[PDB]
Every structure is written in structure tokens, then in C-alpha cells.
Design a protein around this ligand. Structure first.
Ligand SMILES: Nc1ncnc2c1ncn2[C@@H]1O[C@H](COP(=O)(O)OP(=O)(O)OP(=O)(O)O)[C@@H](O)[C@H]1O
Ligand SMILES: [Mg+2]
Length: 385
């Protein structure tokens, strides 16, 4: 057996392994450690990750994205909101499917593929990137999953992995994996996992080395995509003000795809510095756009989303029958937990006895985006030994 840990999310995925008792996240051949969970086909060639993400603009119909949560779902339960700008999920008997041109033709018929096949194809590429870094064929993984994954979805993921010739050793929860990454002593823990298409808040008790979940809140409205949108509307209004009579770039799918990508970029820049640029060439009707926004201004226009996150955490603690005083640690997980302001907002909500594990409010904090993959990798090694 050659084992790795895998986090497999609606927006990004990550791979990790353990060296000398320590987990390290593996960069793929694009140099990414946060690998977009997207598949795309151009001229019969298969792309995944960032190259696939980039094809959202010019090749949306043959790009499958935001499919993690669709795996194992009954078709009636599928919300295709986030697939609107890419391949649309379809009902085909008992399965949910995507119809995409994955053949070289040029007049070849489009393939109708199940989400399960999409996941298999993606996992193959994801594990392939692990194998290439290691020089050995990866055989087995621990994979992280949401706490609301149904039995059908758990089974579907296991089967999709098998079809990718990957042995699943264990499925552990996304929040559990984040706790593990921190090295894990009795305490009450809140994992605030703020992601792209979703946020999940989990309250866990640590009891004699064992974790039990006391309560969870799942939210599909307050997340990084909502933040992206704040920036998109902010700059679209600037563009329109600066270009009287020009068409609204949000109402043109191509212009909107370009705005999504740049806004995300700008957002992430503002997590590491206090000023950031936003620019798109040929945004719409041949017009270029360039502007800037500082962290203070961003936090102002994003405040309503930021307060959504507060109430999710508050809902969760109360759901567990607890009070903020009862919490010993808040672990900030997920890509959106990289946002400096959010750390500050939580540090305000919890008493000084509560600890806030985020890069800016704790000396021992880890990178929020690596927590899950690291935890998976650590669990895979514990199993191997
Ligand atoms: N440095 C950063 N600052 C702010 N946001 C970031 C940063 N890095 C990543 N993000 C955001 O995190 C979100 C995705 O989080 P994560 O990588 O945990 O995704 P995921 O768990 O695969 O997503 P999903 O919630 O769709 O399952 C995106 O909206 C992305 O723009
Ligand atoms: Mg996630």
C-alpha cells in the first residue's frame, strides 16, 4: 500500500502525505496545493484543476464544476445554481448526468456521463498528481466528507474511488480532519469551516481522546461565493459609472465568467495585503476595465456576509445547548477562513478563555486551507501503522 490523505470539496481539492511523522500538502504539476474541483475538455484533451477553471470563460459547456455535492444525490435534491455557468446536471433514469463534448470530433456525439464517472475521472487526475510527486503508484487514501453526507453518498464516493483504482481506507469528517491537523486534553471545540459554495459549523466535545459532535449547522448562502459577488457588484457598478451606455457585464455570461475569476483573485489578495487591484481586459464590448479596492473598503461592503458567519457560529453553539463561554477553541477552517476580518470578528464573540485558531489571532495557528488534507494524511498513516 501507498497511502495519502485527500480532501475533495465542491470548489477545491487537496492531497497530502506524511513524512517523518508530519503531514505535508502536495502541490500538483500546476504548482497548486488548492486544486479546483473542475473538469474540462478541449479538442478531446482532458483538463482538471486551474487549467480547467480557466476554461470556464471560453469553454463553459464542456466543463463540469461544483459536482462534489451532486455525487450520490437523488436528482430532485440537486440545486444546479452553481452549475449554471458550466455543464448543467441532467436526469437520466436513476442517475444524475452531464452531457459534454469529450471526444476529439469535430462531429463526434457528445458523451452523456454520470456524476460518478466525472468524480472517477477527476479523482484519477488528483491521485495521478500525488503518484507523480511520489514516484510510486498510490493505492489507498483516507478521504474527508461533510457530516451531512448520506449513506448513499458515502457509498457513491467509495464506488467512484474504486472505479479510479483507489482503495478507501476510511471516510472521516471534514471537521474531524481539521481537529486532527492541530494535533488534537478534554475540551469543547467549534470548527468554523467557511468554504466556497457552503459553510459548515461543527461543535465537538473531546472526551478521553475521543471526539463527539454535539451539533452542526450547514449553510449554502453565506460563503466565499457570496463574497465574490460583493466584489462583482462593486466593480460592475464602477465599470458602468465609468462607461455610460456600456452593457452590464453581469448580464453577459462571458463577461460574468471573467468577473468571477478576477473578483476571486482580488478577494484573496486582500487576505494577504491591505490593497488590491481588479482588472479585466476586453470585459465587455471591447472595453477594458481596471480599478483597486483596499481592505477597509472591502470589509465595509462585505459586512452583511461577515455577519452571516457570526450567526452560523452562534446558531451552532446554541444548538449544542451551550454558551460561548463553554467553548475552549474555535478552529478556523476552509479557504474563506483566510480572511483576517473574520478571525477578528470571532475573537470578539468568544471570551478571552476561548482560543481562536487563525493565522492572525494565534501563534500556533495553521493555514486554514490545508487543515483538512493534513488531517486526512495523518489518519492514513495512523491506519498504515
Ligand atoms: N486567502 C484567501 N482569502 C479569502 N478567501 C479565500 C482565500 N483562499 C481561498 N479562499 C476562498 O475559499 C473558498 C473555497 O474554500 P475551500 O478551498 O475550503 O473550498 P471547498 O471546501 O472545496 O469549497 P465548497 O465550500 O464549495 O465545498 C473560495 O470562495 C475561495 O475564493
Ligand atoms: Mg469544504
Amino acid at each position: 500500500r501507498v497511502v495519502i490523505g485527500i480532501t475533495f470539496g465542491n470548489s477545491n481539492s487537496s492531497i497530502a502525505h506524511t513524512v517523518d511523522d508530519k503531514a505535508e500538502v502536495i502541490a500538483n504539476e500546476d504548482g497548486d496545493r488548492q486544486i479546483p474541483t473542475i473538469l474540462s475538455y478541449v479538442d478531446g484533451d482532458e483538463y482538471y484543476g486551474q487549467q480547467a477553471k480557466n476554461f470556464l470563460v471560453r469553454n463553459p459547456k464542456n466543463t463540469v464544476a461544483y459536482f462534489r455535492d451532486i455525487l450520490g444525490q437523488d436528482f430532485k435534491s440537486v440545486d444546479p445554481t452553481h452549475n449554471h455557468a458550466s455543464a448543467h446536471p441532467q436526469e437520466a433514469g436513476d442517475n444524475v448526468v452531464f452531457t459534454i463534448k469529450d471526444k476529439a470530433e469535430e462531429d463526434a456525439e457528445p458523451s452523456t456521463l454520470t456524476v460518478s464517472e466525472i468524480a472517477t475521472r477527476y479523482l484519477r487526475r488528483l491521485v495521478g498528481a500525488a503518484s507523480e510527486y511520489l514516484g510510486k503508484k498510490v493505492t489507498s487514501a483516507v478521504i474527508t466528507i461533510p457530516t451531512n453526507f448520506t449513506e448513499k453518498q458515502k457509498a457513491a464516493l467509495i464506488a467512484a474511488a474504486a472505479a479510479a483504482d483507489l482503495e478507501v481506507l476510511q471516510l472521516i469528517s471534514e471537521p474531524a480532519a481539521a481537529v486532527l491537523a492541530y494535533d488534537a486534553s478534554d475540551k469543547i471545540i467549534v470548527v468554523a469551516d467557511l468554504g466556497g459554495s457552503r459553510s459548515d459549523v461543527t461543535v465537538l466535545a473531546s472526551r478521553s481522546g475521543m471526539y463527539t459532535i454535539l451539533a452542526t449547522v450547514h449553510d449554502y448562502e453565506y460563503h466565499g461565493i457570496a463574497l465574490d459577488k460583493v466584489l462583482i457588484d462593486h466593480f460592475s457598478k464602477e465599470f458602468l459609472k465609468k462607461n455610460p451606455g456600456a452593457k452590464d457585464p453581469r448580464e453577459n455570461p462571458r463577461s460574468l465568467a471573467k468577473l468571477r475569476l478576477e473578483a476571486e483573485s482580488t478577494k484573496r489578495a486582500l487576505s494577504r495585503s491591505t490593497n488590491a487591484s481588479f482588472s479585466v481586459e476586453s470585459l465587455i464590448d471591447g472595453l477594458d476595465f481596471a480599478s483597486t479596492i483596499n481592505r477597509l473598503r472591502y470589509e465595509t461592503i462585505a459586512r452583511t456576509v461577515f455577519e452571516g458567519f457570526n450567526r452560523l457560529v452562534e446558531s451552532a453553539v446554541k444548538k449544542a445547548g451551550l454558551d460561548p463561554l463553554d467553548v475552549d477553541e474555535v478552529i478556523m477552517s476552509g479557504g474563506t477562513s483566510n480572511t483576517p476580518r473574520i478571525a477578528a470578528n470571532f475573537r470578539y464573540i468568544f471570551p478571552e478563555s476561548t482560543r481562536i485558531l487563525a493565522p492572525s489571532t494565534d501563534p500556533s495557528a495553521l493555514n486554514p486551507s490545508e487543515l483538512q488534507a493534513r488531517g486526512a494524511a495523518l489518519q492514513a498513516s495512523l491506519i498504515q501503522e
